[PDB]
Each structure stands twice: as structure tokens, then as C-alpha cells.
Amino acid sequence: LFPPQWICCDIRYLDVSILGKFAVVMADPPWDIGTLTDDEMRRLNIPVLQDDGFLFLWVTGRAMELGRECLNLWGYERVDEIIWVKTNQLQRIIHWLNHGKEHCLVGVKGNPQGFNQGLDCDVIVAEVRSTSHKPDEIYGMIERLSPGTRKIELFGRPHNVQPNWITLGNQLDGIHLLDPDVVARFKQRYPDGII
């Protein structure tokens, strides 16, 4: 089912198996630098979500290394890193240095095929809309890479709901599921309907 779907819950307790398989996974996790502890991060059930496919993992500060761990631990090889260049309304650049960018690891699982590798380039430039937000441009890049396919986001916020995307946050407004196979495995796994 092409339109958005979302599930307010706790990604630490949701039987994510009910969600099936996805071509792309993206997570903008709340690193301890809501917070998840590093073991909870390690312990997340990423490996069920993909058989072949790509993972996009936002990092900051010291998640840069842990995220590389979790990435490797869940079974992906980091192939690309994406940079976001944070600009203002006139295209200028908003520890030891002042930070003009945020980072996004890209991992690969299995032998994914049908993808349009090379369509975009590993730098992003777009305006810093709101705080804590990531730019809508990543949904562009990800669409062109694996168009049409199942995509799942983790720790999404109510704006990150998108067509073809199943958003999973704990600020989402309840539960909106339209895909039958999922709507299926849900009521079976969740009869009364709480996590």
C-alpha cells in the first residue's frame, strides 16, 4: 500500500517481524551522547527487516563509531557515508571545531539488485528547517535508488511519514496501517492491541 503508514510504539518492544522485509532501512536514532543506551542500540532487531537491501543510519559525535559497530553488528558493510551541508535561506554555512554538517552512514546487506547505484552524490545541501530535523532531500535520494519498494524508518517523528514508508516513532499519532499482509500479522500478533 503506497501511502504512509506509522506505528507509535517503543521500537525496543515491537515485534518488528510483523513488518516483513524492506529494501531500504533508515534510522535517525537518539544516541546517548528520549535516549537509548548503547546496548539497546546493539540489541535492536535490525536483522529481521532486510534480506537484501540498504540501511541509512544517522550519526553524530561518538555514534560515528558506535553506529559503525551497530551497522556491522546487524550485518551490513558500510559502503557510503553521506554528508549533509547545513545552510540558511541564502545558501551559506550555518568540541574542537564548529560543525557545518551532519553524517549518515550507508550499509548494504546481501546481494541487493535492481538498484540505481550512482544516481546521486554523497553530499546534501538544503536549508536547516526546524531543529533535529533531517532534510526531505534524503527521501528523494532514496526513492531514485530503489523506487517503488518497501522502506521503513525508525525513530521517525510525525513529519517523517512518507509514501512507501512505514514510520516507527514514539511521538507518532497512534497507528495507521493499510498494507494487508502487515494489517494481518498485526492483529494476530496484537489482539487487544498494545505493545
Binding site: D80, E81, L97, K101, G118, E137
Partner: protein
């Protein structure tokens, strides 16, 4: 305005569209800058221990295979004895490119006993001219990771991508390193003739001339200059 979509169309990279007092600290850096010294060395077959005294900053710039489309693999790099010549509290800047180095380079840093504190990312524009099998996107940036041990600048450097087969790194890296004021014993492994610079000890396999003299060198930091931040 969406620049990822525009690049899909035109070929101009998203970075092709970015735009745009503290001058005295540059001058104070200059005063405290030692002479340039530069020693030729086939660093594979070279015992790092000979390089002395122990360094406050080490800029490492190894010829990655990926720079060409004698190279050093990360296998090669990760077997340097960088810890032996670093100083108790000291720093390091490692050019990793965009491939495996993004990861193997962090390994290195941990191996020689550094922990990262900065990810300085060189952004290459293709204004004047609009692929790894294992890649997913067009790679258009390199990473110079920054690590510490013991215990006004930004983390971006934007320039036009150099002419194919040009490998030099954007010199601004030096301005970022030097504006930190981390001491004066500075070391640029795998430098070249072209990068020799005041304040720095270049060491590399293509330097066509040498002037390095371990003793001569140490004298520049003989007391009363031992712990100069080099900005004073």
C-alpha cells in the same frame, strides 16, 4: 530549492551552489614557525623511531590506491609505528578518502592509540566540469579524520575537484591544523616537495632534497621553547 534533484538533472553537484580580524593569529603562527625541514624516506623500509623528538601533530597522507583512476594499502598503513613517534598528549590528521579508509582509518587511529574528536570533510565541487562497484552514490568528498591522545574553524573544506591525477590535498587543511595551536613539532608523513612548509617537518618517498638533522631539529624546541603552543 532541492539540489539533490538538480544534480540528477544537470550534473552540477549540490556543493556547486554554496556561497562564501582574526588575521593576527596567522602572523603569530608565522613568527613561532620553525624553519621548514624535509627528509626523503622510502617510508615502508624506514624505522620511524629515527624521527625524533616526539611530535605534537602528525599529518598522515598516504597514497591510497583509490587516488589513481607505489600505492599504500590500509594493510600497509595500519602497520606503521605511529604511536612510537607521537607525543603523550598529541594529535593526528589522517586523510582517508571516501572508501574503506572511512573505517580502516578509524581502526588505525584506535590502534596507535588515538580517539577521534573531529571529522573534517573535504567537499569537491565540479562547477567547471559537470565509481567503486561497492559504491552506492557518486563520491565527491574526502575525509581527514582528527584524533587526540591524552590531555573559529569549521569541519568543511570546499574546493573544485582537482584535475584528474592531481592528488594534492587542499592546503586549507594546514590553516585548520595551525589555527588550533597544538605545539610546534609538526610532522607531515608522505608529504612531497610541493607541500614543504614553514613550521613543518615533511617526510616522504618523493622529496627530491633533504635537510633534516634530528639534532638541528630538536634545537628549535630546546628550552625555553619546549611547550610553545606555537601561536605566541
Amino acid at each position: 530549492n532541492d539540489y539533490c534533484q538538480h544534480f540528477v538533472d544537470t550534473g552540477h553537484r549540490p556543493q556547486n551552489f554554496i556561497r562564501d580580524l582574526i588575521r593576527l593569529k596567522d602572523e603569530l603562527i608565522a613568527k613561532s614557525n620553525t624553519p621548514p625541514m624535509y627528509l626523503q624516506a622510502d617510508i615502508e623500509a624506514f624505522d620511524i623511531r629515527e624521527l625524533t623528538p616526539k611530535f605534537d601533530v602528525i599529518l598522515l597522507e598516504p597514497p591510497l590506491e583509490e587516488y589513481y583512476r607505489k600505492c599504500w594499502t590500509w594493510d600497509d598503513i595500519m602497520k606503521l609505528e605511529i604511536d612510537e613517534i607521537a607525543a603523550p598528549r598529541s594529535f593526528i590528521f589522517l586523510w582517508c578518502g571516501s572508501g574503506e579508509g572511512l573505517d580502516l582509518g578509524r581502526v588505525c587511529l584506535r590502534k596507535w592509540g588515538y580517539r577521534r574528536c573531529e571529522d573534517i570533510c573535504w567537499i569537491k565541487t565540479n562547477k567547471n566540469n559537470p565509481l567503486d562497484p561497492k559504491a552506492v552514490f557518486q563520491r565527491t568528498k574526502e575525509h581527514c579524520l582528527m584524533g587526540i591522545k591524552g590531555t573559529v574553524d569549521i569541519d568543511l573544506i570546499i574546493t573544485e575537484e582537482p584535475e584528474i591525477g592531481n592528488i594534492e590535498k587542499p592546503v586549507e587543511i594546514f590553516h585548520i591544523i595551525e589555527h588550533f595551536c597544538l605545539g610546534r613539532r609538526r610532522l607531515h608523513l608522505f608529504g612531497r616537495d610541493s607541500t614543504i612548509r614553514p613550521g613543518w617537518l615533511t617526510v616522504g618517498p618523493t622529496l627530491t632534497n633533504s635537510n633534516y638533522n634530528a639534532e638541528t631539529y630538536a634545537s628549535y624546541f630546546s628550552a625555553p621553547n619546549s611547550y610553545l603552543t606555537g601561536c605566541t
